[PDB]
Design a protein around this ligand. Sequence first.
Ligand SMILES: O=C(Cc1ccccc1)Nc1nnc(O[C@@H]2CCN(c3nnc(NC(=O)Cc4ccccc4)s3)C2)s1
Ligand SMILES: O=C(Cc1ccccc1)Nc1nnc(O[C@@H]2CCN(c3nnc(NC(=O)Cc4ccccc4)s3)C2)s1
Lengths: 410, 410, 410, 409
Amino acid sequence: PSLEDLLFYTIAEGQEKIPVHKFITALKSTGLRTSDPRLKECMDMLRLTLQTTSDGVMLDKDLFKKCVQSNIVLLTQAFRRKFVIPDFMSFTSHIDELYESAKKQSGGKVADYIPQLAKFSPDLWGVSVCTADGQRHSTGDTKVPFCLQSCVKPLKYAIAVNDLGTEYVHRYVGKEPSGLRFNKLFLNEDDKPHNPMVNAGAIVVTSLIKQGVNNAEKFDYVMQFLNKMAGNEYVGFSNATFQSERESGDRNFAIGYYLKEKKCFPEGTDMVGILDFYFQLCSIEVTCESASVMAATLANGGFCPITGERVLSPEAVRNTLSLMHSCGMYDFSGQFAFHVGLPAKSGVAGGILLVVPNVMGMMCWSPPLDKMGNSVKGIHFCHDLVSLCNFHNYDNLRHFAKKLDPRREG
Amino acid sequence: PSLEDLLFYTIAEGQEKIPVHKFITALKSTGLRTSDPRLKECMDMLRLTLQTTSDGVMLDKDLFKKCVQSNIVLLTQAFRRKFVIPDFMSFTSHIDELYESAKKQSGGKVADYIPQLAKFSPDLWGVSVCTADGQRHSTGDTKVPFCLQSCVKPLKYAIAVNDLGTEYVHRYVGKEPSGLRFNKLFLNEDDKPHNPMVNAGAIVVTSLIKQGVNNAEKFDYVMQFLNKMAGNEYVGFSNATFQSERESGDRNFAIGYYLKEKKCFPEGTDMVGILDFYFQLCSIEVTCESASVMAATLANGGFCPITGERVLSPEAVRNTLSLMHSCGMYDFSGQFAFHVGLPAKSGVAGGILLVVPNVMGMMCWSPPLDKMGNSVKGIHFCHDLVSLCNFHNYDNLRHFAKKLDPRREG
Amino acid sequence: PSLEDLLFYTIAEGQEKIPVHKFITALKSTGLRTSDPRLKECMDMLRLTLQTTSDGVMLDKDLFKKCVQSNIVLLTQAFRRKFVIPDFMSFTSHIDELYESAKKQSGGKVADYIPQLAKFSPDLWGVSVCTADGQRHSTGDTKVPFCLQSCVKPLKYAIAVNDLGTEYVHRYVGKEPSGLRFNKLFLNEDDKPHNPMVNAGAIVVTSLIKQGVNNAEKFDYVMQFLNKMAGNEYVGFSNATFQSERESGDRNFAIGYYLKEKKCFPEGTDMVGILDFYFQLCSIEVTCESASVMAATLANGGFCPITGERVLSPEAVRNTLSLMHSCGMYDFSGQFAFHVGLPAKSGVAGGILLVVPNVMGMMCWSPPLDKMGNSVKGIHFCHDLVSLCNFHNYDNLRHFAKKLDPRREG
Amino acid sequence: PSLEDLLFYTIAEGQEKIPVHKFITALKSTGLRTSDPRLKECMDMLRLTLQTTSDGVMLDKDLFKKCVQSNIVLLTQAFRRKFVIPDFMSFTSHIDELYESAKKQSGGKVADYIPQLAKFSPDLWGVSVCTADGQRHSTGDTKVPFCLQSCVKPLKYAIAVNDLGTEYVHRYVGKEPSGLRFNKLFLNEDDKPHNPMVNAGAIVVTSLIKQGVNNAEKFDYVMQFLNKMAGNEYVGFSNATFQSERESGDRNFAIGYYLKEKKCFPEGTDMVGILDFYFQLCSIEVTCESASVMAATLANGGFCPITGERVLSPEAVRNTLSLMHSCGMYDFSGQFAFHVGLPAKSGVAGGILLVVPNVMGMMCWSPPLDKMGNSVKGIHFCHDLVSLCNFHNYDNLRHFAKKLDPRRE
Ligand SMILES: O=C(Cc1ccccc1)Nc1nnc(O[C@@H]2CCN(c3nnc(NC(=O)Cc4ccccc4)s3)C2)s1
Ligand SMILES: O=C(Cc1ccccc1)Nc1nnc(O[C@@H]2CCN(c3nnc(NC(=O)Cc4ccccc4)s3)C2)s1
């Protein structure tokens, strides 16, 4: 008996050897990417044996075992259809029609707040999927960088809860939606911002991360933290929006000064500096692939799906998903929690960092926003997504009408 | 091969025949109860053949086989560990520990609004479980009748959505929590009550059920409905509470008139009569066992777990859980949604109607309310429950730290 | 070779005989209805031979031959997938999603002009399809009667051109849209109403049908036509609406008198009587199944698709479609012609008579009008339909980007 | 089995060889022209073997194969009568009678406003066809160059929507016909010109193409666009016409200043410069064969029929065909939309750029205009054409009286 041989004959045909063009397209059809970090060791050993004999792309029973032996447990669950979406290619084609049915919603206005965001083209539209098992798919402008803006608010909240714990973090920021009331107010009635997803609350959260060290070290700590959430995929920084958001942020300055008398920061806070750190964190750049992985990290209880590493404590992810449910889409949050039922977070660059817990993480991106600040195409996509699969938070995994459950086979 | 045979040797021990108490204790240890409605044919023939011969209580291979023949698909999931809680015996032992730690919380005040709820003892405390598969467990004062009071609000909202649909019903009622600055107002800014879980909204929803018939017919139409949600377990009516809620509903009479003014009911509504219907629906009686099956029907996508009949549409159940999530615990809702993450509804009688979607429904009952109107022991129980199992809506089903997952073996 | 046999083994499986439910579910899935008038002999002889032996139910090669013998030419085009939409099962599955996306549009207000249209519920919403070959599908409230109102204008225009020819009819009525300052004016500068689709023009056209005869026969002559256009499905008359349009038609009276000094009718016209006839023609009743067949006759060059009968001359059908293109949706006509590109007609009752030439006719109905008088749901549906298929008048039948073409296989 | 063999034997006679005149006249009778760009390799391989031995003009099955292998799938649908007009030879003979019945209509007066248009003879008259498959036919004066004038308005509108998209373009110009005495006003009540086919709208459209570059580069971008649209057939520039349109263009200046005041352009517009661009764009030269291919690109969903290239987005072609339907013939537009049912666009030079969607494009040219500005012969031809074939937009492709349908056998 052997796990490697059994997998060999499943791909082999009962034939003697496997061409390695056939092995990787068998692999790519599980949705995995040959660049998966949990597979380097297997593809490190395939570029090795694809120089030893440049003739015969072919692989014995025994040559197969020494390329895959290292990663075999992850490869067979991929090949025994044991990933969270077993027929991943069927699901991606649904992602495709979902992408392109959203593609003809030309409504919306791109943020003119800054010359750096009006800059971005209204025809950009990208959707990226990463499952809790690492299966990936993209369509549209999926590797164009854009800034997270307020899509970083759950990520910095998670970091704060991860390092400091729920109870401390919420001495300083609430945990409830304000109400379609106070788009306008900074503080709840305990003189705390309502929740980490609104600018007043985000700024307070930003004040908590890595106290006692300067703002350059603090920023690097969030960036290496954000690196782990993304499996070390792309996360950058556009100094252009950063310097443009510091010239044009009188209300963050309004909020900041509002927080000082009201003694909403912890002792020793340099508010004007924290405003700079906040402006930096909102100009962090990602793609939808990058961001989809961080989404999937939250989809996966704090484990990065493409590295297997523990990034965020489960307590941090639960809280972060809790509040993205209720507060994550500006004024549209309650409507969104009702009709979509997914923890999501939107940003002025056109991003929606969407999380389907226990299934997949996603990132949508189209710069045209509606009049509540949400990517028009993005909102459309998530409505269609829940309208077609039982990813809604309170769909039943047993009785779900004419919806699909991509989590199951036949 | 034939299931009744396969199941026969599973209990048989490899022995000759199965005594019927050995079969009955094996079944009850799966958590099913011999009175299960989906088991009635099987238990009708065990009582019959234990009259056909008053000696030897043992069961041949066909004597067993033609007693379970009608019900075999359910008995096998029961005996093959295929229910959603496979190790139900330890899970109830946890419910017991959970029950008894809430039992030493002597705080709270019993609602003295009317002599009928001040009548109730502060030492009454009951918790009842019913799973999406029909498994039951109770502890404490579990068959004492009490009125749902506002535990009926999700149930009548579901009924309304089932017959009229989301889009119609929500012409008349909102779908968001007010904000804990608006426990006080009746209407949001589209002049709709904020959501079905608050008195103004329940009252509007009640105005929608079964228009065109008188209040006696409406009441029975809702009552037959609650019978189906409860698998025909106890659903009653306390006329004592109803007549006393007719004296002391100046706020409801306030709300009713405020709503008729603002053109909030559908045309042709007799508001004062709807108020009478509303007081009726709030004085409908249950026990925790009755009501736990009621909750399990929403846990189960609208199928009553102990009868298999479809009671509520999936759209009705999803919306009802969506709004119990955010609006279900009066002012404690946002705190509840954060710390417990379970769709729940409380009532001034001491009830909390709790739903763990895809797993189980429950009803806890202790009349002493805290200063926000929620059962003290109930609130204590629900916090302990999710701190011990990954039932929180945004717990991860794969990575959940030191919590238990009763959905899996060990 | 023989045509009945060839169709026999195509369904037969090569097997036995054909169960007659298997023949009829095969027939219905082409979209035909067993009630089709061109199939009456086949279903008469199938109901007959399912009495000749009450106990079959199967079909010999010679028994199949004598049930389909009279109808074989139509059944083969149905079974050789030679109808204008070959995969009708796909297309109706799309129509359903189109219907359900329009169902969530709660905007609009029902015409309260007369108590007869305010009666109608805002949640009535029906869509019905009939192809140039007779294939049908409906969804929603498709056999609820409503009056054509101004959906009759294209039809009476067609009747007029069919009997009198283009050149005579347009002595009295123009053939161009007014332009959106002239919603308000009755006559162009040749002292003719602008076109047959606006009230002044219809009223003049009403004056041309069946001159020299009294109003009872005139109405009856139009009713014979509309029965023929609908294959004798439901077309009725609402005396309720007619008398209320008799009370509240000061404008048609205003218009009627304005048309009389300017000598706009033919000699010998009794203007007030013509106004009465026009009021009758507007309160004629249909359902969307009924009316969808009327649209399909215009889609089909004047032949009723479900009877094969020639109803309108090609000249009448072309002109009526020419003018529904530009003038058919009130103030929205030019926008509708741009974004939808289909000959359509709207009515105050909530109807939209839509024609996809050479393909199919449809009738959408939801009584809520927008602020220009067009069914909100109808307008929404018509956008999504063309946004989904290459039916736009000026889509290309070869290069049409990511749109669907139901005229094509795969 | 092999297609070059099959096509060889369908042409061959069943004899062993084909004279290559028999192959060329058989090819021209499908209506394709040996100059078709999609046949270039094929004619490269017979320009070559028509030197290997200069007499003995005949072709084996393997020699035939090595010239047509490169172009084989386009050549058989040509020879298996699978083009959208299978019997092109009768259709062109119908186009001929339509040409000659229209040629006897001398009504009209040549545009006399500028000397360069007075220059043109009243008896010049050309009609050229190009089908969605590349079949070509002409009659009369079909590569005498003349300016598009206002026949360019759909093309610059197509370019605009192709690069910028429908929603942007129609921020600045409407999408409906004005009303028959609103020929005189420049703006509707949203302060946009009514549509891209009227001068105010065209002038605004001209303001949208290729912003941020100077007017020499702008003009070159449009001509690269028109080159692709015509499959690189004739497109020129009459500097004579351009100088008469600038000396004598007071309404455009009126329009330009009226639009600038009402802020009808996008920010950063140089109005007097855009008027200059608009005047040159209107002096672009074509022939009827040239333009008929441009028409055929619009008949064909934005793909040029003689090169296979994707030129215009499908969204762009639909909108342009939409608006040529309702707004394309000046005051005669509504009448034309009723009786002809074809998207057409007329110009002061005497052109009518006509499109039969999914079938063919054509360009008519006779300089005598009627009293609404449309070529008399062009208008006559467009009436007779639909009077003969079910090309009317709302003709039925199934029940169509005695009109003939060249699309079927
Ligand atoms: O003008 C409108 C419009 C309007 C609409 C309908 C009716 C009337 C007016 N809206 C404004 N929004 N913000 C404004 O000014 C500043 C920025 C936000 N600031 C606040 N944060 N938190 C607050 N409240 C408490 O903290 C309660 C509290 C609870 C317990 C103790 C102390 C205070 S105010 C102050 S003005
Ligand atoms: O007890 C206090 C204490 C208090 C605390 C701090 C300062 C002093 C006093 N305050 C009261 N709260 N409620 C009261 O009773 C009234 C009956 C119901 N009323 C309303 N319901 N819903 C509404 N909706 C809109 O108003 C939206 C809307 C609609 C159109 C435009 C704008 C907004 S009004 C209010 S008294």
